[model samples]
Target: MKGSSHHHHHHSSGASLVPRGSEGAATMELSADYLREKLRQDLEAEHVEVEDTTLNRCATSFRVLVVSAKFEGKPLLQRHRLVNECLAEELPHIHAFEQKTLTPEQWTRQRRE
Candidate 1:
C-alpha cells in the first residue's frame, strides 16, 4: 500500500515502523527511509525532518518538520502548501500528513524560544 504515517514525538515517544507493500494497496505502507529520501530530494530544504511515530499502528499518518531557505519569504500556510504540492501525487495514498513548515530563520528563532 502507498500511504504515509504521521508521528507526534511529544505525545508518542517510540519510533514508528511502517511496512512496505505494493502500490495502491489499501494499507498505508511506506518506509521511513523512503519518505526521508523523497523529502530530501523534493523539498531541497536546508534542514528537514520526517518522523514516523505510527508505533506499529495501522494508521497512515506523519509529522514533518521542514526548514528551507525557499520558505524565507513565504507565509506559514504557503510553506505548508508547498509541501502539500510537492507531495500531491502521494497525498491521495496518504491517510494524514501533519506538517511544521519553517524558514531557516524562523527555525533558528524557534530553537532559542
Candidate 2:
C-alpha cells in the first residue's frame, strides 16, 4: 500500500466500521506522508516529491523525484539501489516505484549547459 484516503461506512449494528487492511497487516499501512518523511531523513534532499499514481484505487504504485547531493557521483542504478535500501521494509508491499534521482548539480545543469 502507498496512499490511502479514509471512507466512512455506516453499520446497521451501530458498531463503528473499521477499514480492512490492504497490506494484510493492520499495523503496517503506508502513506505518502510517511514516505515523504522517510525520504527527507534518508536522502536529505533539497527537493523531493513522491506521487501515488495508481488510478485503480491501488496505493502500491508511485513516481518519485529526488534532488540531493547524496546522489552525486552515483550511477543511475546505484541511486535507485540507495532508494531501495532505504525502503527495504516497504518494498514487498510496493507494486511499482518509478524514480528520478538527480544530484543538485545535475538538476541545475538540466536547465542549462
Candidate 3:
C-alpha cells in the first residue's frame, strides 16, 4: 500500500441540486464561499478566489487564487509558504490543494490579460 492511491469514481456536477445521500459521496463537504471568506480573513488579502474543482465537488480539494501586497516580490515557493502558514489551522482539513499567489501589481496584470 506504499504507492497505492484510491480513486473515487462518482459524478459531482449533477450530483447536487437535491443532494441525495450517495454511498460514495465526498468525505468532506465545504462551500467555495466558506473557503473564500476564510482565506480572505486569514490572509488579510485583497482578493481571494476559490473554486471547488474536484470530481467529488467537495471542500477537500480546491483551486485558490489569492492576491495581496504580502506577496510582493516574493518567489513562488515563499508565496506558497506564506499561504500555507496562514492556513495552517485549516490545512489539515484539506485533502487536495492548488494555489496561485500574486501581489496587487501582478494581479492587475493578470486582470488585463
Candidate 4:
C-alpha cells in the first residue's frame, strides 16, 4: 500500500479595476461677500470689490479690486503679492482670479480723473 496525498493551492493576484466619477476637477464654492470681507480685514483695505466671473456658472472664478494704505508705496508686483498672500488660504479653492490693487490715493485720483 502506497500513501498518496495531493495538495491544491490557489494563487491569484488582486488587481484594481475601480472606476471613478469624472475627469474634470470640482472646485470649492466661494462667495464674493465673504471674500470682500476677508480682504477688508486682512489688508485693512479702504475699498474692496469682489465679483464672480466664472463663465461656467461656477463660483471658483473671481475679479477683485482692493484699495489700501498698505499698498501705498508698493509696486504693482508687490501689491499683487500682497493680495495673493492675503488670500493664501482661499487661493487653492479658486480656479481663476483677477486682481487690481491700488493705494487710497490712487483710488481717489483715479476716480477724479
Candidate 5:
C-alpha cells in the first residue's frame, strides 16, 4: 500500500498586538541641552545639569540640578516654584520631573562635604 504525501508550509500573518518598536511622539521630543539652556537663562543659573532619567518603559523623564545666585534669599518652595514656572509649558510633555534648586554658595559648600 502506497500513501500520498502532502506537505504544507504556513507562514504567520498575524498582526502584533503591542506595537513593540513604536516610540511615542512625546518621547525624545525634548533634548537635555534645550532644558539646560532654558533653565540657565530663566533662573540665571550659575550651573545647570539636566539629566535624562528615562527608563525603557518611560519617556520624557528628567532630573535637574540648578545652582543660581538668584536662589540666595529664596526658600526651597520658592526656588522650586521658580523652576516650575520657567518650564510650565514644557512640563506637560514630561512623564516625570525631579528638580533640585541650590544657591551657588550651597553648591560650593556641598562640594566640600
Candidate 6:
C-alpha cells in the first residue's frame, strides 16, 4: 500500500532534506523533519525514525525506520514500495536511502531479539 499527506508538522529530526534532485540530483533546502512528519501522519505510524547519514556535508542521504500497523501482512517489497511511492517527489536528491519498514507485531519481536 501507498500513502501521502497534506498535513505539515513542526516536529522533525532536524536534519535538512534536499527534497529531490535533477537528472544528476541537484539539491534544495528541506530536511528529515519533512520526511518523518509526512510518513508518521500518512501511515499512522507508531514510530518514525529518520537519521541523516550522509558521507560528508550533504542533504541527499538518509536512514529511516518506520513501524506501523499499515505494514501488517505486507512483504518487504510492498513495504519499501509504499515508502518510496510516498516520497517519490523527494527521491531525486536522495542518494543513499536505506529503510526498515516493519509492522507493530514484528517490531515488538525485533526488540527482544
Please name the candidate that would achieve the greatest TM-score relative to the true structure: 5
Candidate 3 clashing pairs, residues 3+ apart or interchain = none
Q: What do the candidate models score in CA lDDT, each in turn?
A: 0.70, 0.74, 0.72, 0.75, 0.77, 0.74
Best by lDDT: 5
The lowest-lDDT stretch of 10 consecutive residues in candidate 2 is 20-29
- Candidate 1 segments exceeding 4 Å error: 1-29
Q: Which of 4 and 6 is the better model by lDDT?
A: 4
Write the residue-wise lDDT of candidate 5 on 52-83 in tens digits.
86545646588888887788777878888988
Poorest lDDT segment (10 consecutive residues) of candidate 6: 21-30
Q: Residue 98 deviation, candidate 2, in Å?
A: 1.2
Prediction 1 TM-score vs. true: 0.59
Candidate 1: tens digits of C-alpha lDDT, residues 9-109: 55736765789644663344465556666776776777767777664677868777767777767776777787788778877766887877666666687
Model 1: worst 10 consecutive residues (lDDT sum): 25-34
Model 4: worst 10 consecutive residues (lDDT sum):
21-30
In every candidate, how many clashes are there?
4, 0, 0, 0, 0, 4
Against the true structure, what is each candidate's TM-score? 0.59, 0.61, 0.55, 0.60, 0.64, 0.62
Better of 2 and 6 by TM-score: 6
RMSD per model, one decimal? 15.2, 12.4, 11.5, 13.4, 14.8, 14.2
Model 3: runs farther than 4 Å from truth?
1-29, 54-60, 73-76, 110-113
Q: Identify the runs in model 6 with alpha carbons over 4 angstroms from their true place.
A: 1-28, 54-60
Give model 5's TM-score versus the native structure: 0.64
lDDT tens readout by residue for model 4, 9-112? 66668867778743444342367777778878877778788888654664557888787777777776888887789779888878888888877776787796
lDDT of 1: 0.70
lDDT by residue (tens digit), candidate 2, 1-113: 63785655754555566896444542345766566668778778788877886435645587777888777867868888988898889877778777787777777877562
